[PDB]
Amino acid sequence: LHKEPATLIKAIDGDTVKLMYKGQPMTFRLLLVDTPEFNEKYGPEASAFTKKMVENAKKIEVEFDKGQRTDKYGRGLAYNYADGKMVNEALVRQGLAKVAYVYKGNNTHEQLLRKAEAQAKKEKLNIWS
Ligand SMILES: Cc1cn([C@H]2C[C@H](OP(=O)(O)O)[C@@H](COP(=O)(O)O)O2)c(=O)[nH]c1=O
Numbered sequence: 001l002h003k004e005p006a007t008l009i010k011a012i013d014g015d016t017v018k019l020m021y022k023g024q025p026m027t028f029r030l031l032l033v034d035t036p037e038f039n040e041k042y043g044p045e046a047s048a049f050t051k052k053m054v055e056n057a058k059k060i061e062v063e064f065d066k067g068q069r070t071d072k073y074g075r076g077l078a079y080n081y082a083d084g085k086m087v088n089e090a091l092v093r094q095g096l097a098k099v100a101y102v103y104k105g106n107n108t109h110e111q112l113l114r115k116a117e118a119q120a121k122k123e124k125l126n127i128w129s
């Protein structure tokens with residue numbers, strides 16, 4: 001896979017962000033994770049975690065997997081990086097997302113993220129507390 005440039009337009013919630021990609025505004029949904037909705041337990045904390053990560057970054061990148069690049073709602077499906085750190089992985093490592101929505105052929109980073117989830121669960125963090 002390849003990292004490609006993007007710039008932040010606006011934080012949305014734990015697992016969606018509005019970015020400019022190839023010069024066009026797009027909502028991205030993060031691959032292989034699920035954060036609680038803002039109205040659920042840990043939802044606000046997930047939203048804040050992602051917001052801080054993308055707003056503080058100097059360099060935002062997106063990385064598409066091998067399969068579908070947009071979902072049925074028109075959201076881009078990617079792994080998102082903030083100063084080289086994967087947001088998808090960071091959310092799972094902190095117990096603020098579950099590994100989820102693992103579809104065949106868009107699952108390159110599945111085992112990296114399951115390893116993070118096991119570590120967050122071991123530490124009893126957030127969702128796993
Ligand atoms: C992460 C992801 C979600 N989706 C779709 C499945 C879900 O459909 P439904 O809306 O019918 O439940 C929805 C979950 O996103 P949200 O967790 O953002 O609600 O997005 C994909 O199609 N591919 C994906 O990789």
Ligand SMILES: [Ca+2]
Pocket residue numbers: 015034035036037
């Ligand atoms: Ca969600």
